[model samples]
Target chain A: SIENLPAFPREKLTLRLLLGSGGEVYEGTAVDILGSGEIKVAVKTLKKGSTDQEKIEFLKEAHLMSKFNHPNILKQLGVCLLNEPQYIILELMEGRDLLTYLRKARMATFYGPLLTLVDLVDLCVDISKGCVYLERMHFIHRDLAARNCLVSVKDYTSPRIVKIGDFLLPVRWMAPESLMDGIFTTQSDVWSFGILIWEILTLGHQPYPAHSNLDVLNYVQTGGRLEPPRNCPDDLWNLMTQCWAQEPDQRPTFHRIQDQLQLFRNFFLNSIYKS
Target chain B: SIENLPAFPREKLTLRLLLGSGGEVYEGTAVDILGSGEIKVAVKTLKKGSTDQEKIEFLKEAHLMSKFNHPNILKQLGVCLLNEPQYIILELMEGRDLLTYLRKARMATFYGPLLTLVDLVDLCVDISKGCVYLERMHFIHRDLAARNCLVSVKDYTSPRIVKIGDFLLPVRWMAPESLMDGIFTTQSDVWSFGILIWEILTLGHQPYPAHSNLDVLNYVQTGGRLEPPRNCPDDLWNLMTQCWAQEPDQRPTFHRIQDQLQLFRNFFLNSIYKS
Candidate 1:
């Protein structure tokens, strides 16, 4: 199970400054020793002491992420799991999480340029495009949020690129059935897709902010739903509401959302830019 | 100044459970003893040992809050400052902050029903309506976010009533010029008005999530703007973008934002329901 992938020599990579640290993963910049080139990368390593179970899940997640090859998905560079503190290296996103991007735009203290409406809609379209790819691969992303979506804000203008990333079991974004029985499907992902839409619209606000994890279970089971975010357009809200339908079967596919969002984005963009 | 406000007799009230606590204020329920009735009210009190400066600010805040007579703004029930532990009695909001309400809706563990698109858009309209009133009263809400806004989710359908509450120097929500020279005016409030719209659209997501307080100052001064939130309609995004204009003169007034939002709300609501 361990030898099925490509591995990079430890000597070829020199770990540099830390970029981010959370849970079992720690990201940072690295130097490509042979090329003497600076490489911005994320190295997923275990935290504190690692249990066999934790190691298993980590390896499994890396393996799953490795297989994805879409532009909208975060790319896996290589693995260094042969040594202690096994590392799963990934391409670094300079702009950080989409959630942070949205939140930072609101701060008077942030130094980065704020994203325009066109930029934001493009992101929605980009994420849906990624989702379409996931569905094609028969993959299920049980969690989706601005936090899980990364942006390379190196160029903070048009075509603000985004990539889907670091998976978590996000309770706030999970569908009712998924929460009830640990069942995950593309449909559940659709529900989460709706949540991601809300998160982006709310500039990365948390979903179900004050509700306890158990409270969300009861609320969703009881047919409760999220209200439209402020300024959420009627069409988008309707699309998301459909994604949250009680029956998973009633939800629109990622393909449908992708197309609809694309149309909405184009229409809105033309109207704003032309006028 | 102290004697101008009506005082509630200490003997006539009984304090109950603590609902929330932050900075210099703490909130809880109280009973109307003489009336033999439970009163859900917020008692804003000092934190730890109080200072004369804190006392002055507290009383000033209470006094200002007391004068506002608008449905969309939080109401001040009465004050009990004659006693040592001075209390600013205000109507309790059972639903908590709008930010939390939006965040909680995304959680699977929350027990409350989620707000619908109509409910969310109505909140935008409601807040704008409040802003209109503030403009008339010559009041400037320097701070506005889902955090500063309160919701009474007693009935999470139709009218998910929201009341603008609290007062803070929110750097994330401030306009570019407001951050530079400490200049505040209705125009600055208009800048925040756009931020509130973004917050609602994104379901109470924080404005400027990861940027430091100082970073926001630089970003806005350089004309950095928030990108369009996911699912944010073009028209709404255009309105918010206008709110974020580098020049305050270029931005729309609260009255303008309120009216436009109302029109958008009506149009969107009609499209969804009728279809």
Candidate 2:
């Protein structure tokens, strides 16, 4: 039984899925559920009407956020126990999701160095570190994509904080295994994250831009690789392709990704210093 | 393919799971892979003839530990890439798991103040907080028993640290659904954790001590709940029973568990003041 409680005080802002996990976590702007701050937070809306497992999943997300105290991951402050559509307060970042933020920054111009190539590389490292942490915790983001990552207010600074919300994400961002075989794990997340890296590098480009969702599915199974983004370095693209390896084992873990990025981070910083 | 290369004599000590995304985490001592430290780490042994999914699970655990930068959760330094039975270096805690630690503390006296009432209550708070953190990260420690939680070195001053590991646990500590339908979720973790609380409260007394694993399963299915530990406060017992609730939703969330223990923390501290 889906609880389609149409935004009691709601609007057409958040998204939903039908894995039917029953517990719902969505991004919404609530005015301080616990009277601390007037910030937008991800709310896990569940009720007595839900199944036993659903409540656990809902609480699981909240509990997971508490365990992660890193800058890249989202921070769950507390919950609003007073009522239904219970609110889980997170530190507010008044920004677009990663997809929208990158596009906005890019459209503003590479004309006047609006967002340099180095920034996207830096974004990749931030998110890779976030995944590195998640992999270590033995938790799978399940659905990792640019749309799911909450970015900070878009400006020249591009100051962003990427929080991996494991709730729900678009199908396009999923891995071949998840899309085809219903297998979801950290490897799948790794696949999704590889796509995410591509998204940011392409300046928030749509994954498989010229195809429908079904075609993208076929693309993955038919030994397809995401085409390189504009101005993307050969090494980074190599990493993305590694993640898209038809066989999951060939894909590198976030741990390996971090190690590989070691070279990139050092190189990127070096390039910055020289420039 | 399981890589069993040993004593590579490269400069590193344990293997970080490196986001293997499998249930292959293993405890080993590693030294200087990236050239440094002979520390003990939790390495999820992957590949050397493992499945694609298995490798993912292994890396997931490794990456998960790396993400956890908390005092209570175990620390995963890095992975041993050079050898087989690959060493995952965890922070060296010269102590047994929580169960054994509590048992040792108990044997020192009448299943009693070998660990003070205050300390037992405090430990409950500590572990509950750990679960609370894990739940937030969306991780279900399906095997959340005293034996899986690592305690700090044995000392009367009780140098205690509790880190929840995701692999290998006893069945007696599991909840009803886990025994019946094989559903392992955060609520199930809560149930396992409830038994852990009972174990500690009883000063590491075994859960369903008189029953076989099968018998414990039947016991839970038949609505039999574990009795309160000796001298455990009624309020604390209430929370434990809540975890043992037949309907998982009826069980307490780790967040509430933490809150419930918070009051006891103050109570324990106050009792000390008066004593």
Candidate 3:
């Protein structure tokens, strides 16, 4: 039904004075007869001088996101492909990135109660389901992490549903193979998911807090895993151990990670269930 | 090691019905704790009119909670039986019980977006984890809800936790079987936890807003389920649906319920990891 609607012309689209991209994103409402209210939406426009390769990649990523029909996946509401300084419209996420939200809360004191351990797990679970769909598409997400994950401003009883992060390339989230040999796969995504789990447990602390990305690569290349995050549940640590394994084949598939996640929850909750 | 420590003397105990039960409970510095500083805790006290049976039940509940050593389960402190109007002490929680915190915030309006939905999942996951421990102990809470369950309160009281249980069940949270046959079990508790989840969404608004206990029972008998709250995230609505199922067996076990929760959250947060 949305396809039948008019192509929201770029000239007619009135964005905020900041004009989205970088820190200043454009916020505006769409015009639709069926959807009458000022439904707030955020816009992310690409930089004007993208190289041919980057332009291709950008369009392809939009196409990829459009193909996804799952609720867990962030819906790509049509893009403004016909215009210059191109942009993509999507469901505006309420909360900022996981790291920002956590740090902001933590500084206030007593923020830990709101960021519960189970929540740490639920956040990762939502990400994993999205990866599962990507794997189903035989597509591989090369990067993943807490900062990229967008949390809806939805409520406590809200399941804290997470959608795929906006597309970005990265160094920290890459698997050793990708970092060293320049490769990417669903397996690589699984590795990032592990680090994302760490970010949440530490309430979005950097994975190797004291080390530089250069040093981290050196340390990880020599067969070292990041130390267990302070206060991370022990059962969840088991999954992290598996995610950071040396070989890509050793890592669990997204679905396997999804199912086995229940196992860890069982391990954590079962301890309490009995005594 | 704790077994070897001294029992908290009844004479030394001071409380408010409303004192929190456990960790860091007391706000003011203690008179002679070895650490010589603030030691907050929560409490569950028996009323003066409590019968022999009620008194015994109260102590048993304390005994059950005391045996718990897991992070998710709230630990119980010692109770006073040195005289009537007795009580048990627990780790002091920083926030109000989930119910009051929810309802109190609901009226204020701006509260929903602040706590964030992720925090709510963590809260329920924690409550469910507590239930898991109870089931393992071959125990049933018999009473579980936003009100019955505990959360730490802040700013309003001394560091001590708040509690106000007359030890009566709120019928709206009861499962159908429990209502008709006066039964209690982990499964029924699951139903209550589901309602607890609902409490969180409505910002602690009552489950059947227009109904009395009698009407709630009649509505349930006629197969009325609590309609999904407005603007509820869909994945959560599914969990509520499963939770409200008439057939107890079809309802997920605490572990399964917790597991499905993990999967959804993973998808939710994973999206943020990549660009």
Candidate 4:
């Protein structure tokens, strides 16, 4: 009977594929769950034969997730490790990621720079706190892109709370060493943080969109760093640059990063009220 | 009787006080533990008449330190909250912080670059992991300068481990918001991380030493970023710039940071054999 039960509730779920073959993600239907008083779960499927290494890595990640018990991190409810197809069961998040919200907000006439600044700072603080917990357990969330970070608007007035996800895409966010030699140190996470910043500031624009993957790889190999998004504030631009630094040793540690973010948040808050 | 036990041992530890005054740091003598057969400790005292707010802050910090169960973070063995003076008792570390080691190593030979880089990367990884744990508990270190970070060469063959200390000196390494408005957020920690990078590369040189504190404060208000240290790699410089960004919202989170650092460390390791 337990094996027969679906990994997720079939009646209370919506199957919508956000990502396509070309890596483009688009919103599908606005499934209504308001009247039903039921949680709407999204069913994400990974292709079979996705490599044994990837499955092993997923198992490793699940172990790490089991160790972490935090409010901000997405709760791992259950998992279906069947011989045919293995999958993880995650808590259904209500809202979109910060990057998606930023893109939508930026396009609207109501979005202001001050509000964006506040939202971003709040998001950074929440995420950092979540990340701190992971580091303690000797675990690194190698992939930390905007899409991977889920934002929920439970409180209407306050800043949205963030829950980071997508632990399976570590190689993409990882630094060259981790990709090449399997060194998944904390410094590698900092490099991914730079890309996340770029995504946040650019309203979900992809980093190195113009260049091919090979070109980007070559550039990185030759000590090249990612450029800050256009119109990014000087302070933010500087921070992003640091995140993309070639030498992980020279990058700022998370503790220092938390201090820096608080400083900017205070400045923006004061300036916003004054104005 | 339990409460009134001596804060420190009756006999003074043989560890030398290498640096004092600006901030107190006790260094340990190289005498063998087997021969000496005595456990040594270091006591650092805070300035007198520091406000109740400051004292309360330190107490809260002590509370956090007590909860911290990490191998890399400086062990706060005990704290004395007596009248007239307050003190923090820490494990006596053998080697200097990465900065001092870098400076001394540099003075000896040019090969110091590779060696110091490796040492710094390793220490930073551990430091980041420790801070990540602290952040999960909603605790911010506030002060994360090179001086606050202790390096111990307990193991000869391996690199020195980083032990973060000094929770009270919030002003120096704090982000603009925390420094100006008493807001301690996780992003503020990232800013401090940027400064730590500078310290590591420059061998503990004070950021903006050419400018007075007043001048630095004024410049920071208008979005002045820290200048990258000379002879640092280009990628590392970019990462520092991002870390020192004025806008907290734009700064990268620790997860990404960890990834980047891993890449750099891997690169160094791979190149070492090639060289």
Candidates, DockQ: 0.01, 0.01, 0.02, 0.01
- Candidate 3 lDDT, A1-275, residue by residue in tens: 23231245565455653543552367665544124545556666777777878778777767667667776777666567776677676667766566766565444323132444555566777778888887888877666877667777533333466777666436667789988898777777788888888777777676776777668788888887888876555667888889888899998777888887767665644443232
Model 2, runs deviating above 4 Å: A1-275, B1-9, B14-56, B109-113, B167-170
CA shift of A213, model 2, Å: 95
Q: Residue A34 lDDT in model 1?
A: 27
A126-165: candidate 1 lDDT, tens digit per residue: 8999999988998887778788889885433223689999
lDDT by residue (B83-151, candidate 4, tens digit) is 445666667775555556555443432212223344555666777776677777677767677766776
| Deviation (Å) of B38 in candidate 4 | 1.1
- Give per-residue lDDT, candidate 3, residue A247: 95
- What is the DockQ (computed on Cα atoms) for candidate 3? 0.02
Compared with the true structure, what per-residue lDDT tens digits does model 1 show for residues B1-275? 44367577767666666655753354555566226577667777766467879888888888778678888999887788776677777787767788877765534112121444445667888898898898898888887777888887532322357898885457888877777778898898888888887887776677777677778777777777776777566778889889888888998988888888888876864443232
Candidates sorted on lDDT, descending: 1, 2, 3, 4
True contacts kept of each: 0.00, 0.00, 0.00, 0.00
TM-scores of the candidates are: 0.48, 0.43, 0.50, 0.41
TM-score of the A chain in candidate 1?
Answer: 0.86
Off by over 4 Å in 4: A1-275, B1-36, B45-61, B78-88, B108-115, B154-158, B168-174, B179-182, B221-223, B271-275
lDDT string, candidate 4, A166-265, tens digits: 6643333568777667776788887887777677666677677776665766667787666666555566667767766777788777776666777766
Better candidate number, 1 or 4, judged by lDDT: 1
Could you give candidate 3's per-residue lDDT for residues B22-127 as a string of tens digits? 2213332122333444465555556677577976777666655556666666665555567766656666665656666655434322212224455566666676
What 10-residue stretch in candidate 4 chain A is worst by lDDT? A22-31
On a 0 to 100 scale, what is the lDDT of residue B187 in model 1?
90
Q: List each model's interface RMSD.
A: 19.5, 29.2, 13.9, 25.2
Selected candidate, larger TM-score, 1 vs 4: 1
